[PDB]
Structure 1
Amino acid sequence: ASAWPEEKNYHQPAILNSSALRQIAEGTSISEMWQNDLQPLLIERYPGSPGSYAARQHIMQRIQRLQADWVLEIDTFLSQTPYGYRSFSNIISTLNPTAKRHLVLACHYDSKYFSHWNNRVFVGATDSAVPCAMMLELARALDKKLLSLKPDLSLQLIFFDGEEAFLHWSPQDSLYGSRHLAAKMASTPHPPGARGTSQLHGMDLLVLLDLIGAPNPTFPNFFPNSARWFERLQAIEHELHELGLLKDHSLEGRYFQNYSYGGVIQDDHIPFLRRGVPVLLLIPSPFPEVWHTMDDNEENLDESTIDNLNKILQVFVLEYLHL
């Protein structure tokens, strides 16, 4: 019985030097992301809505235009909800589908349902349009390097549907897409033909982004089994900073601070965490001031903070995949 599922326990990053770091910082464009990946997603997109359909087409189209060999799958299912049975569709974008191991980045593309109020519409800018856009900008920025993948380890992106409760949170009303996908992955043999390993055993680490985009985010070190990766985020943030590659940034106001947070946060990582998947959680604590409010809009986003996190995330991914 091969011990490949244990390889993630010992995987070490291939650290980028200064020159490569400047290259990555210069390779990403916050303005390009803003216009081409984020704005099209700032629309009402709760499950089953026209906006949900449009967001999916946007996410799919932006990935399909890239050179790397992304395999796109739409995972569609029915679930009971407070409003009766409804259909949901997770979007999975995978490089090297038969690769045994994958580093996984994830977020949710649905927006929380609210009836229009005073002609205001909830578009969930930090929740989670920006994370969706950061993942698309990461695919774009690193396209040339990812193309070379065409450790038996690759990259996967998941855009969950139905993360949000239709009413207020309850065990049965929330995480529709991730509860569904986690059980499906746990019961799908991997790699193809495998006798006793599942897609879940194949997930090296789930990097989950949500509620990102507000000013001064502080991300705590949530879990001991991914602490050494949280430390790499800190090391990367620190070096990008020292090299003068971040904007409007200081170490005292650093994003990754090593304080723990013991409580549970309800988001898409939960169904995976509870089945044994190591999670690196990029959800700040406290949550943005505009959380679940009509003010979670474009106007309240912090552009240089998103740009800074894009650089950190991209360096982290390259170092993880040895690219």
Structure 2
Amino acid sequence: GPAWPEEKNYHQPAILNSSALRQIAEGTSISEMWQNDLQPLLIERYPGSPGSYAARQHIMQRIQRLQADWVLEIDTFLSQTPYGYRSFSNIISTLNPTAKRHLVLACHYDSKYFSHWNNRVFVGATDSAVPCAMMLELARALDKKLLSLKTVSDSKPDLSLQLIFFDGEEAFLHWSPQDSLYGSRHLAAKMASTPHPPGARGTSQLHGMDLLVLLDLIGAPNPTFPNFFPNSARWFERLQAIEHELHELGLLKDHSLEGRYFQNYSYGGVIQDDHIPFLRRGVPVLHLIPSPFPEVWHTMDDNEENLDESTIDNLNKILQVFVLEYLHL
């Protein structure tokens, strides 16, 4: 009904039991993600570079090989930058494009532009090659479950899944209102002015975004994710509960509840990131960015060598469980 944009306010998860939690933990592979999804992305890939094209092709190819009915769209646009007009390309991967509601996971796939120093190149391992690879691994690990979302004569889902890989999150020169968030600013405005579902008189694609889960700066040891917003606080609590359950079942590695990732801790300030253009239009956001930022932030040391594989593996399991429970799969 025309209250369908309010359904997100009443939506509850379908909780997984212990057996299912073990199955999900066993179904993801950090080493396969590392070799097949993460390492091809550990390249210079600022917007418009050859590496940006190679990264986009890799992301699309890894989604395209899956059995689930992903619809891939490239959102290419022109923007002014400190280096003049440039082209950018957001990547969107949607299951059930005409379903009214989607849970949305997102990160940025560009890497910040820097000069090279003594044969060193910035590859943004935490920022955000690892979030990209986590999203690809979730699509792979959950592929057989997500296949059941596919629209047939028997069933068409109200609620499905979408992935967004933003281009141009980073400033080209100096972080500023004109030099930042190129892809997310563009895509939020575009979705805000696109009727959804097709044929709708008065609702946009933005109204169908149940929840935007934004991964950024993930892969360093001991991350702490604050609970940022009152309208996603209850979903933050579900992340806490999932971390705690997986912990008690012995399904996490190198993990203590004293140093857990999702603490009883909120953050009143603003973190400027790709969620802001969505947040400012009323989309609920779960912002999975650590506070403080990793010490390697925007340095040449944000590389593969300094990633913490167990932390990523643990967060893969938590995120996959969260997504299945949200979608009732």
TM range (shorter): over 0.9
> How many aligned residue pairs are there?
321
Deviations 1:210-257 (A, max 9, x none): 000000000010111100000000000000000000000000000001
Deviations 1:46-92 (A, max 9, x none): 00000000000000000000000000000000000000000000000
8 Å CA contact 2:111–2:123 kept in 1: the answer is yes
Cα displacement (A) at 1:167: 1.3
C-alpha separation in 2, matches of 1:278 and 1:47? 28
C-alpha separation in 2, matches of 1:262 and 1:244? 34
Cα displacement (A) at 1:258: 1.8
C-alpha separation in 2, matches of 1:273 and 1:151? 26
Question: Please, which moves more after superposition, 145-154 or 216-225?
Answer: 145-154
Cα displacement (A) at 1:118: 1.1
Cα displacement (A) at 1:151: 6.2
Cα displacement (A) at 1:115: 1.1
C-alpha separation in 1, matches of 2:268 and 2:179? 23
With the length of structure 2 as denominator, give the TM-score of the two structures.
0.97
Runs of at least 4 residues off by over 3 Å: none
Cα displacement (A) at 1:263: 0.8
Question: Please, which moves more after superposition, 247-256 or 165-174?
Answer: 165-174
Q: Answer yes or no: is 1:136 the counterpart of 2:142.
A: no
SS of alignment partner, residue 199 of structure 1? coil
8 Å CA contact 2:246–2:252 kept in 1: the answer is yes
Cα displacement (A) at 1:30: 0.1
8 Å CA contact 2:220–2:294 kept in 1: the answer is yes
C-alpha separation in 2, matches of 1:192 and 1:81? 33
Query: For 1:293, which of 286, 291, 299 is the aligned residue?
Result: 299
C-alpha separation in 1, matches of 2:43 and 2:206? 32
- What root-mean-square deviation, in Å, do the aligned CA atoms of Structure 1 and Structure 2 show? 0.6
Cα displacement (A) at 1:168: 2.3
Deviations 1:176-224 (A, max 9, x none): 0000000000000000000000000000000000000000000010111
8 Å CA contact 2:73–2:93 kept in 1: the answer is yes
**C-alpha spacing 1:231/1:58, structure 2 compared with 1 (3 Å):** same
Gaps of 5+ in 2: 150-155
Q: Answer yes or no: is 1:23 the counterpart of 2:29.
A: no
Cα displacement (A) at 1:96: 0.1
8 Å CA contact 2:99–2:157 kept in 1: the answer is no
C-alpha separation in 2, matches of 1:266 and 1:111? 17
Cα displacement (A) at 1:125: 0.1
8 Å CA contact 2:79–2:85 kept in 1: the answer is yes
With the length of structure 1 as denominator, give the TM-score of the two structures.
0.99
Deviations 1:127-170 (A, max 9, x none): 00000000000000000000000760000000000000011210
SS of alignment partner, residue 60 of structure 1? helix
Q: Answer yes or no: is 1:314 the counterpart of 2:314.
A: no
Task: Tell me the equivalent position of 1:119.
Answer: 119
Query: For 1:159, which of 157, 162, 165 is the aligned residue?
Result: 165
